């Protein structure tokens, strides 16, 4: 209907979600467990349906909305700011991912914390965090952006430190609190500089008149610093702290004692993506900045390598996922440094969806293992959590970027557009290559050690989960709702990623305008690649193949199948050679 296209209902449904969350928080005695669950489920489902309707219009067609709620605050003599929301491609790209992951995490969170005394508090905290993140990405001016920035930091401080009776979790939450205070300082100083320069806080206007101030300088006490350089420096600093780049990443692994739905939301999109959003929100500023040009690829590649290698050595499942998230944040920073804004969105969506699904599977495994998150005390879990095993296999083969999967394409697109003109290019490229191959190691380690190793766990788990009296059609080591949530999340992820791939990677370009005038020749090597580039990518392909052979055929222990393992490796090599000969030359 044309009325829906002219007047969005996203605002109405989001307000319904927010007000239901707040009133459930205040009137929690009237609503029991079931009442809170049902009310917030209805609100979140309506919000998701409305945003799903508008997703196609905003992404494919050139639809966007500027909504003003009213004049809000006086910030200068004779100056007032209003509460503005900008529902455009950049905002909807983050908001739809956050809302979908949040809907499925919400349904999963009731099965998780099944008999805990404070399920309602966790549900409402997750709702508050999602609302804050959605408000952050839908900002219309800088004041609303700062409000969302401070809200995501505050609500994540409560999802962390959920076990408020322990000071040990209080320390972990306070670490992130301090890092968020530093982020807020940097962002607010950058906003102050912007307002002192242009005397406006509207983002859109800022994106269209900042090029007029490229040749300007500011006078620090003994320095004359370019305006774009200092503004970009502060924005990049706060983005680095939120996105947990190297050095400022130490708060993120210590954030893992939060409940696993909170980890699924925080580490997949939302918080870790917030910094990336900033880079996408203010693209011209960083296009005109020398500091960004030098610092994004170097720090991104170092972070990618560091996170990828540290992840492959972890034994805690949540720590492995957290370090994988750090590596992927570095990869996203490099992808933004590429200069192609579509590749960033594709990487964001793929990583967020599959990382959230992997967190859900890991959370079910951890609940089965009775709060022991180290897979040194696991093994042979396939017969007790079969759905977890199979769904986890799918999610890890997609997340690790294995060949012939959806996650392969984002890595390939990243390596297509990499700029070779950097002074520190050798280090950047080596770090990127070493971080790209690390996914197979931690994916294989996690899957094999949790599900298909020897029994390393305690006898109580296995023996109590296998008594004869428990044989029934109702037998299960998880909940049906968890299985349905994971299944539907995977299906929706596949559908959305395929739709985005069609929109961006087809011969007919269909994506809406990204409001950026910096265009490079990166798509050429995607559209008309040449021979040396194909050979160069084949090199990394064969490196990954060698690593897969290593993780499959290496015997680190004595076994009755050692000799037969060597024989099978020899048979596979000979068969591959003969198969290649037959497929290439004769018939």
């Amino acid at each position: 209907l044309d009325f829906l296209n002219e007047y969005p209902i996203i605002l109405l449904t989001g307000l319904l979600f927010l007000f239901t969350t707040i009133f459930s928080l205040i009137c929690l005695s009237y609503l029991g467990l079931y009442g809170v669950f049902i009310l917030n489920l209805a609100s979140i489902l309506l919000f998701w349906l409305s945003m799903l309707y508008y997703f196609n219009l905003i992404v494919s067609e050139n639809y966007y909305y500027y909504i003003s709620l009213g004049k809000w605050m006086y910030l200068s003599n004779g100056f007032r700011v209003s509460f503005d929301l900008l529902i455009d491609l950049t905002s909807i790209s983050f908001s739809f991912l956050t809302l979908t992951i949040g809907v499925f995490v919400y349904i999963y969170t009731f099965s998780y914390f099944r008999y805990e005394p404070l399920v309602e508090r966790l549900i409402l905290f997750l709702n508050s965090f999602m609302i804050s993140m959605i408000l952050l990405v839908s900002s219309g001016n800088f004041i609303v952006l700062f409000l969302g920035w401070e809200l995501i930091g505050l609500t994540s401080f409560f999802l962390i430190n959920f076990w408020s009776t322990r000071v040990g979790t209080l320390k972990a939450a306070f670490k992130a609190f301090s890092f968020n205070k530093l982020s807020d300082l940097f962002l607010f100083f950058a906003i102050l500089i912007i307002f002192s320069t242009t005397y406006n806080l509207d983002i859109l206007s800022f994106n269209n008149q900042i090029y007029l101030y490229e040749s300007y300088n500011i006078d620090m006490f003994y320095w004359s610093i370019n305006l774009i350089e200092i503004i970009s420096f502060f924005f990049i600093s706060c983005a680095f702290i939120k996105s947990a780049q190297f050095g400022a990443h130490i708060w993120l692994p210590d954030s893992m004692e939060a409940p696993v739905p909170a980890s699924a939301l925080i580490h997949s999109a939302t918080l870790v993506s917030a910094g990336i959003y900033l880079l996408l929100r203010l693209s011209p500023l960083f296009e005109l900045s020398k500091y960004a040009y030098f610092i994004l690829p170097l720090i991104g590649s170092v972070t990618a390598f560091y996170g990828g290698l540290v992840s492959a050595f972890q034994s805690d499942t949540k720590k492995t996922l957290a370090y994988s998230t750090i590596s992927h944040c570095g990869f996203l920073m490099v992808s933004y440094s590429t200069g192609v804004l579509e590749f960033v969105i594709l990487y964001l969506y793929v990583h967020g969806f599959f990382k959230a699904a992997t967190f859900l599977c890991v959370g079910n495994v951890n609940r089965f293992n009775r709060n022991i998150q180290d897979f040194k005390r696991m093994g042979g879990f396939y017969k007790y959590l079969p759905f977890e095993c199979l769904a986890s296999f799918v999610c890890m083969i997609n997340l690790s970027g294995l060949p012939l999967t959806l996650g392969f394409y984002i890595k390939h697109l990243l390596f297509i557009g990499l700029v070779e003109s950097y002074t520190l290019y050798p280090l950047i490229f080596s770090s990127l290559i070493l971080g790209a191959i690390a996914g197979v190691f931690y994916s294989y380690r996690l899957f094999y050690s949790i599900f298909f190793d020897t029994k390393k766990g305690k006898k109580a788990i296995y023996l109590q989960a296998s008594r004869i009296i428990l044989n029934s059609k109702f037998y299960s080591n998880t909940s049906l709702a968890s299985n349905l949530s994971i299944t539907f999340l995977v299906l929706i992820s596949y559908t959305v990623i395929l739709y985005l791939y069609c929109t961006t990677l087809n011969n007919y370009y269909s994506l809406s305008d990204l409001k950026s005038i910096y265009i490079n020749n990166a798509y050429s090597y995607f559209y008309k690649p040449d021979y040396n580039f194909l050979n160069a990518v084949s090199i990394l392909n064969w490196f990954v193949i060698i690593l897969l052979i290593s993780v499959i055929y290496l015997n680190w222990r004595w076994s009755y199948y050692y000799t037969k393992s060597i024989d099978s490796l020899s048979k596979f090599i000979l068969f591959s050679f003969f198969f290649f000969i037959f497929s290439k030359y004769i018939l």
Binding site: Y7, L16, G32
Partner: protein, 70 residues
């Protein structure tokens, strides 16, 4: 965790189930929807939108962007 007793005098929220939660859910949901509808109806007055497909902005029209006469 195994359930443990909670003192009656404390207004805390451990293991609470309200038997009348359906009516309370109804009476918290529908007025919330009405309030949000009123807020959205007020906010649509101040909502902007780019021109639709097949439409162009006449630069000399009053709706077109303007400069300032000094």
């Amino acid at each position: 965790f195994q359930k443990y007793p909670i003192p009656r005098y404390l207004h805390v929220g451990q293991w609470i189930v309200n038997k009348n939660w359906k009516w309370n859910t109804f009476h918290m949901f529908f007025p919330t929807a009405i309030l949000c509808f009123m807020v959205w109806r007020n906010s649509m007055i101040s909502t902007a939108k780019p021109p639709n497909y097949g439409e162009y902005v006449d630069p000399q029209s009053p709706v077109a962007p303007k400069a300032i006469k000094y």
